[PDB]
A paper describes a structure:
The crystal structure of the translocated region of D. dadantii IbpS (residues 28–372) was solved at a resolution of 1.7 Å using the single anomalous dispersion method. The asymmetric unit of the crystal contains four chains A, B, C, and D that are nearly identical (rmsd < 0.4 Å). The structure of the IbpS monomer displays a typical SBP fold with two α/β lobes connected by a central hinge region consisting of an extended two-strand β-sheet. The protein displays an additional α-helix at its N terminus and an extended C-terminal tail (residues 352–372) that, to our knowledge, are not observed in the other members of the class II/cluster D family. The C-terminal tail connects the two lobes on the edge of the substrate-binding pocket and appears to stabilize the protein in a conformation similar to a closed state, even in the absence of ligand. Furthermore, the central α-helix in the substrate-binding pocket, which is involved in iron or ligand binding in several class II/cluster D members such as AfuA39 or FutA40 is absent in D. dadantii IbpS structure and replaced by an extended loop. Moreover the ligand-binding pocket is partly occluded by the C-terminal tail and the N-terminal part of α2. We observed two dimers in the crystal formed by A and D’ (symmetry-related of chain D) and B and C’ (symmetry-related of chain C) that were original and not found in other SBP structures to our knowledge. The interface buries 1230 Å2 and is made of electrostatic interactions between α3 from chain A and α15 from chain D’ and vice versa and between the two α15 helices. Several residues involved in the dimerization, including R223 and R337 are strongly conserved, suggesting that dimerization might be a general feature of the Ibp protein family.
In this study we show that IbpS, a protein secreted by D. dadantii, can bind Fe3+ and Cu2+. We demonstrate that exogenously added IbpS reduces the toxicity of H2O2, probably by preventing the Fenton reaction. Our work establishes that members of the Ibp family exhibit the same fold as SBP proteins albeit with significant modifications making of IbpS structure a prototype for this family. The reduced pathogenicities of D. dadantii ibpS and Botrytis cinerea ibp mutants reveal the importance of this conserved protein in the infectious process deployed by necrotrophic microbes probably because of their impaired capacity to detoxify ROS produced during infection.
Residue numbers in the entry: 28 to 372
Amino acid sequence: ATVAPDTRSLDEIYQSALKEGGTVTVYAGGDVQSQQAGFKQAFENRFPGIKLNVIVDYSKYHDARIDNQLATDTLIPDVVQLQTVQDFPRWKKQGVLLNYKPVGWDKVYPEFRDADGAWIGAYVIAFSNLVNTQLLNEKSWPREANDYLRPDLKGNLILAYPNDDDAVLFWYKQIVDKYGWEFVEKLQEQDPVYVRGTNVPGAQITTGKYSATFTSSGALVPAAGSVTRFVLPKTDPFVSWAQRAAIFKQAKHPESAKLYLSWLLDPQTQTQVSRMWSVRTDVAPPAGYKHIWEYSNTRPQAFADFMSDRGAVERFRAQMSLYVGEAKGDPTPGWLGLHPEVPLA
Ligand SMILES: [Mg+2]
């Protein structure tokens, strides 16, 4: 089906959405439900009477959950938004996605959108250095990969399990490409602490238990008095991608789903709610930064290309497992089962 970019205002979409019962359900990729709390609060304040029933789980479990619900005709969500970006062209070809070009679709950087409107990049996430600014002075913030091998960072590092999250894994793929397996070998001698949940390193660094990590997201504009800082490398690669979102063809609440996606793309949402880069060409990067596509030391399309070859990803993941061990501990989102209809208690 051929569609044109939505020309309606948010309020015009919103009045139309209100007829649907006052709830839109979103299966969103993430480590913990709290990561979506800001979006939920902003959305529900902006559109009174419509609840953003967003449900967080690892992307690698949400996509399987959607595949199984499709197979059994028990589909629950209106919208899916994940970092497993290779799923979206597959679901498109399967015919289960609603072609919709949201408000602002024309301004989305072309590689961050499906040409027919089958899916859209919602916002940009990047994984790189996160440092404790009270433990480390600015001149000593580690920024390059080999900075983490210096003696005064031994025992002071906490890291997300690369074998539990493919975006984390891709950071290592790039670094091994450049510096070889010797980097991973030397890194283990630093006695890093590995954890599940990409939220956890930043959480424990904030409390002062660790000094730094190199596979974390973070605010480009930190809040006043923040003890942490997201810091890019000067030269070394970092990971970035556009989180992908789509509406299902069988969505029970298509107008509300449309509202959500159009709201995500709004310039205010892109700069005031989303905490990193925007997918839009007409949205200024935060002061001090360039557009994500202007950094020579990251390539969002490289993550997508990586994720398309499951065999290559698996082989690299398995080798990393031999260096860091099996991913230990409980899954941070909790265990949602096959048919979560609301967030966990
Ligand atoms: Mg030792």
